[PDB]
Design an enzyme around this catalytic site. Structure first.
Site, PDB file in Angstrom:
ATOM      1  N   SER A 130      19.115 -53.954  57.161  1.00 34.26           N
ATOM      2  CA  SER A 130      20.049 -52.847  57.052  1.00 34.26           C
ATOM      3  C   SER A 130      21.518 -53.172  57.385  1.00 34.26           C
ATOM      4  O   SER A 130      22.398 -52.344  57.142  1.00 34.26           O
ATOM      5  CB  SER A 130      19.583 -51.682  57.923  1.00 34.26           C
TER       6      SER A 130
ATOM      7  N   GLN B 266      12.418 -44.547  53.199  1.00 24.60           N
ATOM      8  CA  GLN B 266      11.992 -45.509  52.209  1.00 24.60           C
ATOM      9  C   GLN B 266      11.843 -44.937  50.825  1.00 24.60           C
ATOM     10  O   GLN B 266      11.425 -43.787  50.647  1.00 24.60           O
ATOM     11  CB  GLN B 266      10.639 -46.092  52.611  1.00 24.60           C
TER      12      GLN B 266
ATOM     13  N   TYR C  74      18.503 -41.047  58.872  1.00 24.32           N
ATOM     14  CA  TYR C  74      18.775 -42.415  58.414  1.00 24.32           C
ATOM     15  C   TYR C  74      17.852 -42.764  57.243  1.00 24.32           C
ATOM     16  O   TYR C  74      16.622 -42.702  57.364  1.00 24.32           O
ATOM     17  CB  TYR C  74      18.589 -43.379  59.590  1.00 24.32           C
TER      18      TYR C  74
ATOM     19  N   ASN D 250      17.333 -45.299  53.447  1.00 21.50           N
ATOM     20  CA  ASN D 250      17.635 -46.264  52.409  1.00 21.50           C
ATOM     21  C   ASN D 250      17.890 -45.541  51.098  1.00 21.50           C
ATOM     22  O   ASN D 250      18.821 -45.900  50.367  1.00 21.50           O
ATOM     23  CB  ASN D 250      16.446 -47.193  52.168  1.00 21.50           C
TER      24      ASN D 250
ATOM     25  N   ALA E 282      17.004 -54.885  60.086  1.00 24.76           N
ATOM     26  CA  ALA E 282      15.689 -55.469  60.201  1.00 24.76           C
ATOM     27  C   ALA E 282      14.948 -55.527  58.900  1.00 24.76           C
ATOM     28  O   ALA E 282      15.186 -54.737  57.982  1.00 24.76           O
ATOM     29  CB  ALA E 282      14.853 -54.695  61.238  1.00 24.76           C
TER      30      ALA E 282
ATOM     31  N   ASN F 293      11.640 -59.690  63.982  1.00 27.58           N
ATOM     32  CA  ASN F 293      12.151 -58.342  64.180  1.00 27.58           C
ATOM     33  C   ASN F 293      11.694 -57.931  65.574  1.00 27.58           C
ATOM     34  O   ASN F 293      10.515 -57.674  65.804  1.00 27.58           O
ATOM     35  CB  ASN F 293      11.579 -57.403  63.118  1.00 27.58           C
TER      36      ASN F 293
HETATM   37  B1  LIG Z   1      17.099 -51.292  58.101  1.00 29.63           B
HETATM   38  O1  LIG Z   1      17.084 -50.447  59.323  1.00 29.63           O
HETATM   39  O2  LIG Z   1      17.012 -52.728  58.486  1.00 29.63           O
HETATM   40  C1  LIG Z   1      15.887 -50.945  57.180  1.00 29.63           C
HETATM   41  C2  LIG Z   1      15.562 -51.810  56.140  1.00 29.63           C
HETATM   42  C3  LIG Z   1      14.438 -51.602  55.349  1.00 29.63           C
HETATM   43  C4  LIG Z   1      13.608 -50.475  55.622  1.00 29.63           C
HETATM   44  C5  LIG Z   1      12.301 -50.283  54.877  1.00 29.63           C
HETATM   45  O3  LIG Z   1      12.053 -50.944  53.859  1.00 29.63           O
HETATM   46  O4  LIG Z   1      11.394 -49.408  55.350  1.00 29.63           O
HETATM   47  C6  LIG Z   1      13.971 -49.591  56.681  1.00 29.63           C
HETATM   48  C7  LIG Z   1      15.088 -49.836  57.433  1.00 29.63           C
END
Ligand SMILES: *[B]([O])([O])C1=[C][C]=C(C([O])=O)[C]=[C]1
EC number: 3.5.2.6
Length: 358
Positions: A61, A117, A147, A149, A315, A340
């Site tokens: 992210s 997601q 939050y 994506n 992550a 992670n």
């Molecule tokens: B981010 O917080 O690093 C992030 C990246 C990918 C995802 C996912 O694919 O569920 C969530 C959060």
């Protein structure tokens, strides 16, 4: 590097790697506008490849910061406005729940409950359309922050629409290239595979899987050197010669919404500095960072505040990254690990290091 910086970093990261069992890690401290590197462990346990300043890590992210800036650049270029409705760039999006949902909302996770997601089954271009057409808001726009994506990711895709460039092409030409981030990729080329660390999840070597809006939400891989450079550019946007990019960076650090003592920018999240450790430390834990929270609008948005703790966690299944900087103190830090591990541990270490440098 000044023994001062060397001591603080080592005294802080050594026990972190030990306690979190991090296979490999690279750290960059930007002090007085100069970068200092540190590296530990393995990029590839199996092939005994060590982590170096050339090792590529998945930013997860933290990629959202690049997207926020690229969007900021598009605004500066007059190609889009954060006040424009989402449908202006995707007229095919006719469902009435989209009425009133602006690019600002997509960019800041305040559209009304877009999910974290994008479902795995959503792949094709018509699949994404259908996904958004069917989505049902749990809240009115501009009231709640969740939050996601699927929120900032859509913002990234729509934002480059007028440029006529593909997201990746826009990102390279408009952000990577001008900033000389030459070993930063959305898709790592065959030639660089040798530098691409393996992520480790439960001891298994893994790399991030393809997904819809992956490039826009979490698909950037970079080196500790390029990330140090990314930090400096964000600490001092005026040093950037490309007008729209400089302006883009400032826009991403403006404060649009507030929740608790956190402020939402475009990709970056900011807090008033001096900040309270326990507040950014626990404020980072996924128990809080990913939850549904009411937001107060900042009308109009506050332009980038120099005395702020600007940061972002990142992550992937196998990677854990973290970036944080204080514009006012010309101070910053980048932490890239191929495991992670808990966000609080990242923020805690980052704070011990920067606080000890002012
Ligand atoms: B981010 O917080 O690093 C992030 C990246 C990918 C995802 C996912 O694919 O569920 C969530 C959060």
């Amino acid at each position: 590097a000044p023994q001062q910086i060397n001591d603080i970093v080592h005294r802080t990261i050594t026990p972190l790697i030990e306690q979190q069992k991090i296979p490999g890690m690279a750290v960059a401290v930007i002090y007085q506008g100069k970068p200092y590197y540190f590296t530990w462990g393995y990029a590839d346990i199996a092939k005994k490849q060590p982590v170096t300043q050339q090792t590529l890590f998945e930013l997860g992210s933290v990629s959202k910061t690049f997207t926020g800036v690229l969007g900021g650049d598009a605004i500066a270029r007059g190609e889009i406005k954060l006040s424009d409705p989402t449908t202006k760039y995707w007229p095919e999006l006719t469902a009435k729940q989209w009425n009133g949902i602006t690019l600002l909302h997509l960019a800041t996770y305040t559209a009304g409950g877009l999910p974290l997601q994008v479902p795995d089954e959503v792949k094709s271009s018509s699949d994404l359309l259908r996904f958004y057409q069917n989505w049902q808001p749990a809240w009115a726009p501009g009231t709640q922050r969740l939050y996601a994506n699927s929120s900032i990711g859509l913002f990234g895709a729509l934002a480059v629409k007028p440029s006529g460039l593909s997201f990746e092409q826009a990102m390279q030409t408009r952000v990577f290239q001008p900033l000389k981030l030459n070993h930063t990729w959305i898709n790592v080329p065959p030639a660089e595979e040798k530098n691409y660390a393996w992520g480790y999840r439960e001891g298994k070597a893994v790399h991030v899987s393809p997904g819809a809006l992956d490039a826009e939400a979490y698909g950037v891989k970079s080196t500790i050197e390029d990330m140090a450079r990314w930090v400096q550019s964000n600490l001092k946007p005026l040093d950037i010669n490309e007008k729209t990019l400089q302006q883009g960076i400032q826009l991403a650090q403006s404060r649009y919404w507030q929740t608790g003592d956190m402020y939402q920018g475009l990709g970056w999240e900011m807090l008033d500095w001096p900040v309270n450790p326990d507040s950014i430390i626990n404020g980072s834990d996924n128990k809080i960072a990913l939850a549904a929270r009411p937001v107060k609008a900042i009308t109009p948005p506050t332009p980038a505040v120099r005395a702020s703790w600007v940061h972002k966690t990142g992550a992937t299944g196998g990677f854990g990254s973290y970036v944080a900087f204080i514009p006012e103190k010309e101070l910053g830090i980048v932490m890239l690990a191929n495991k992670n591990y808990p966000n609080p541990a990242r923020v805690d270490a980052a704070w011990q290091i920067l606080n000890a440098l002012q």
